[PDB]
Amino acid sequence: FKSISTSTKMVNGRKITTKRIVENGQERVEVEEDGQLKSLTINGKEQLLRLDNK
């Protein structure tokens, strides 16, 4: 079920940390560099949520 994991990487002095979260068959992903994200997708889907329409 929901899992809280990530992945680091020392890229030319750049601690790229990608967040991997596996909940209801979905893998969250967001690269973090110097306290700054550049990506944020879900199992390959750019979207947060829509409680209004589920």
CB 41 within 8 Å of CB 29: yes
How many Å apart are CA 29 and CA 12, to the nearest integer?
Answer: 21
Residue 8 C-beta-side C-alpha neighbours within 13 Å: 6
Q: Which experimental technique did the depositors report for determining this structure?
A: NMR
Domain ranges of the chain: 1-45
Contacts of 37 (CB under 8 A, 6+ apart): 30, 31
Among 33, 30, 31, CA closest to 41: 30
The tokens describing 2, both together, are 């929901």
